[PDB]
Amino acid sequence: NGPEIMSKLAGESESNLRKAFEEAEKNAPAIIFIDELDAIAPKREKTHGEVERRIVSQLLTLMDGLKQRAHVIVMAATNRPNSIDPALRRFGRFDREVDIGIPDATGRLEILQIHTKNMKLADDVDLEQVANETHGHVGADLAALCSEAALQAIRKKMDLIDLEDETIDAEVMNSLAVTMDDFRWALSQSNPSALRETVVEVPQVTWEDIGGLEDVKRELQELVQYPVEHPDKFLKFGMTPSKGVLFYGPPGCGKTLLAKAIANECQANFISIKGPELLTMWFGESEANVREIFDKARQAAPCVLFFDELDSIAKARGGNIGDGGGAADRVINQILTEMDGMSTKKNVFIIGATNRPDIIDPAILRPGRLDQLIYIPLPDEKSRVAILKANLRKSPVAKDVDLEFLAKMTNGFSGADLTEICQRACKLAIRESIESEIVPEIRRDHFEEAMRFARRSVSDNDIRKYEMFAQTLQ
Amino acid sequence: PNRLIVDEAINEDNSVVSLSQPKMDELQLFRGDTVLLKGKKRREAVCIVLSDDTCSDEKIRMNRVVRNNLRVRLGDVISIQPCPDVKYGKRIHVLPIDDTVEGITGNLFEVYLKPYFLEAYRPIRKGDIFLVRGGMRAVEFKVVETDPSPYCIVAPDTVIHCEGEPIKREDEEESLNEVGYDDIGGCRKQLAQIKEMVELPLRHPALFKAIGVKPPRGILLYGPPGTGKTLIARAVANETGAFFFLINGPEIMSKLAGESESNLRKAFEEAEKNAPAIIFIDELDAIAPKREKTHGEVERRIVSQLLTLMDGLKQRAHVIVMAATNRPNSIDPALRRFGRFDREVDIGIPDATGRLEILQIHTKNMKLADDVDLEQVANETHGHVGADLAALCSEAALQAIRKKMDLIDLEDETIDAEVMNSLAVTMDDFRWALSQSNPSALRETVVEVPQVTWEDIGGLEDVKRELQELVQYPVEHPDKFLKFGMTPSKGVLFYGPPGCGKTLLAKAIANECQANFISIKGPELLTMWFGESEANVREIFDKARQAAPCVLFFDELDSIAKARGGNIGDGGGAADRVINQILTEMDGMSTKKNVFIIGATNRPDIIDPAILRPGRLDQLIYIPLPDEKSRVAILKANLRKSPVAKDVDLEFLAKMTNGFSGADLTEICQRACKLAIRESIESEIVPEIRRDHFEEAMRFARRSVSDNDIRKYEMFAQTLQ
Amino acid sequence: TNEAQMAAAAALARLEQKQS
Ligand SMILES: Nc1ncnc2c1ncn2[C@@H]1O[C@H](COP(=O)(O)OP(=O)(O)O)[C@@H](O)[C@H]1O
Ligand SMILES: Nc1ncnc2c1ncn2[C@@H]1O[C@H](COP(=O)(O)OP(=O)(O)O)[C@@H](O)[C@H]1O
Ligand SMILES: Nc1ncnc2c1ncn2[C@@H]1O[C@H](COP(=O)(O)OP(=O)(O)O)[C@@H](O)[C@H]1O
16 A cells, blocks of 8 residues: 555665565566555656655556566556556556446445345335435445444433443343344445445436426437447448537426436436536636546446536626627636547547527537537427426326316426425425324325416526527527 | 442542442442441451442542552452441551652641541541642651551541651552553543553453454544543553553654664664553654655655554554644645554543643642622633643732742742631632633633523524424434435524524524534635635544534535625635535535534525535524514523512513613623623612612613514515515 | 422522522
């Protein structure tokens, strides 16, 4: 490990590193694991000392010596593949690499089940509920969560019976069960170590969650699935697959769900980039992070890379007024650069979303980039009913609720606004049920009341702009 | 049988322990009966049992005086039995311990022991050690001879002797003036979390060896200087008995290459030899600063040396390393990875209750006059930490000493006990100290559970209920939210005229929920904008995550727009560095952490609309100027603290103050009270506030919200439907 | 017994006068 080598004085770190490789050969076949590699061999530009640069050279020669040290494989761990001396990545040495990342909801459940194999669980314990709530956790944190839940159970019972001795009677441990309140307690006290890391996983959004837009669903299938389901037909007819699509139209109509749903059907890793992240890179002059985002998309392939709020910077710059310049900036330029260098056969599909196409750098829409543009209008009569049914799919709803009547009233509402109505009607049912204990379902009266407080978020002034632009593109 | 777990007591008395009633019934003892406690090494103590609503069934609550005599520590278990045959004593002999009789002479019996035993009716046992406080000194005594045995109650008519040299403390007992948990005032919740992490690995190591669980091996405490970070680390070692090793960054860093590593490594090796042990490294950011922030070989290597020493704790049995820093982000991030320092506790700044607790702790030995009010001081000492509150106690004592004692005593090291006990500290002495002291942590944000309740808010009946639905229901009735697929809101924004109770609303819901309240004000968002230091937003939200359940209140959300020109500004948009980081943290915050965000503004027309999208502050509540019935309610509420004459017409006042905000109605009530007080003072050179005082107050009070502003606020609220 | 109840009355009075 880094600290063990770097903590040594000049001359000691080099000898100790060499000995480790000699022992691996003497005991071959052998595996050497170097943890915190970036602590011993950081990117060269980050170190100027003679001793730090010398120990890097010592590692490079020992790695090359593996051509003689038969049957010795050296593995190393770092936080970022680009934080280490690039020389290590030359043919041989550390040319092969594996992206471990973080577990998804399924992986988190598996980890919790593994670290509870020896644990006595009460009948109320449900590790799936924990895995779904433990957002941002990594295996180290899930193991801590299980341990903390066990420690709470230990304090409650083991001290209660005053079992103070050198050994524990197995019968006492046999009856020591950890309850769901002890896992939830551990969750409330714990704190995810990877909460702000990029989360890359196959989404759980399906097409049944998106009301309306039947033609857009089919279009995404042709854009994303067909190029890999029928590659011989694309070659046969000389087709050039599209690398991405831009969604435009009124906000709150499903632009994000559309990108997630196609990623789910294709079982592809979904990467979500939001406006605030694009703005952070622009404001901090750290557009180099865009290349890392695209590099992750390549590593995660097949994947769907979704750039939301492409207009966030154009708006921040003033949008309609701003300065006298153009739409180009540090971040969008790096995005275009990586797009142009993206290989068609890497199975990376890029989806964008904007709410103001008139301020998006038109360069991004040229052939080879986001050449496809899909308009997402306000849902129509049949779509709004489908949206209401989807939002109410997880709740009991009374038979007196007329979703078709309500959809007819909400003529100017977006899908996001129909959700607010559903949540308002639910909210009323929540209070009514709670009050009855101081009710079994959402009643028509709850929707009729909610309808009088909800309003359309997108006015007719914005819809006319969206429709005229959609008409301009034919 | 009759076994109880030893824990801390609320009742500080040297002869009182507390049990929960179910154990009093099984032990067949009643409130007020005398019991015997059997500890370790054939040691016993006699005490009276009372009861309360805080002791658990399996625990016995006792103070340090009883635990010291029993040679037991927190987390141990003792045996309890009743002894109803206890009678009064006849003759006892009690002598002080030399460890405390230093710098003092005179008749210590008349000063300490006689007030302590006279009409006190305390049960004692031969060999009992107890502490008597007074005269700004704490003196402990031992019972060396009694006629009855092995215990008796000392009645006012018994004979007590005290003749002979002070007794040297024995090696089997600890001094009662040593640092313990009872010396720590505020941040008691943090101490509880640390106890859960540390007490069991050290007190019962057999359970961790036998059970497949891993103990913590490193706890990082952070907060401003003077809050008790070093006090907690030492108090824990003293209570558990673990050997305490002290390390500090500046000393180790001052050493040359090879010397700093040897000194740091040695301390770890010594802890293993003396295990169980606790290693406390102060100024962690000084001994192990971020490697990417330094250039020297020594700084890079010493970080690597600490990192590998921390990993070595898997082999060093029963060694826990604690550390203190000012900020969790001022240390090399490797220290905070799984293992090493994988636990952290936010000590912060003591709250209003803790500040009083600290003042009470540091006055235990002080003789206070009847006019001294430490709660009033605790309310005025905003921004003060334990180091400053202790300074106030010492400075107030010095004012009493220079007025009286320095006119009595000589320039020597010894003072008669009677002179010390004759000295009392008055409110003028604490007031002087308060004006001289300057808070050492006034700039940092203070997080605490507020004392504001719903009864403090006049009007807005529907808004008070709304906050209960937004904040309480999602956790009080989670099965209903799941049943109907409800998604709780993450926050709400208040808008409207100033001075209508927006601050009380956010605090009142935090109060009833028993949740921490984090107050972020405009100047904080302005500083981050102008200093290009928006990273501080992440620390604010991170505190909310660690302080949960909590309510995170962002006031003056319009201050960000003002920083860039507000009403005019440049040609750009509403997005900027500060608001973008705020929005990012909001999106990354889950309702599963029981954190609710409340915003407020007096200029909603210039708030970045992004913050009002679903997932952010999607709920909008309008807080208008109070109406006719609410203004009366506000006036009545503010007058709950003082008698009100029958001639006071609160409805008439409310009818006149048509354009007044709640803040302006408060000034009227407070001014009328001050006018009544003025008349009361003059009458001695009155018992209630008279109509004349309210009518006079009306001549000076004015509305803070103009008619032009009222129309602007109403038109905006109407536009939102 | 009665001497213990008198000890309790004295200890309780001390605690209540100081804590209240
Ligand atoms: N067609 C639709 N079907 C179902 N729900 C929808 C639809 N359109 C919008 N919604 C609801 O509106 C919310 C916002 O949608 P989203 O696409 O995230 O907005 P945006 O992409 O503009 O940020 C979603 O959570 C979803 O519940
Ligand atoms: N939370 C606290 N509760 C009680 N006393 C405190 C607290 N914090 C500090 N003090 C007091 O203030 C002083 C702090 O001094 P010290 O122990 O050197 O701490 P520091 O690490 O801040 O220098 C001590 O007299 C201590 O008793
Ligand atoms: N509705 C109300 N009921 C009672 N007191 C109020 C009310 N509104 C304001 N006050 C008084 O006015 C003072 C200022 O309130 P605050 O909400 O802090 O105003 P600001 O808008 O300046 O933050 C408070 O200390 C409170 O005592």
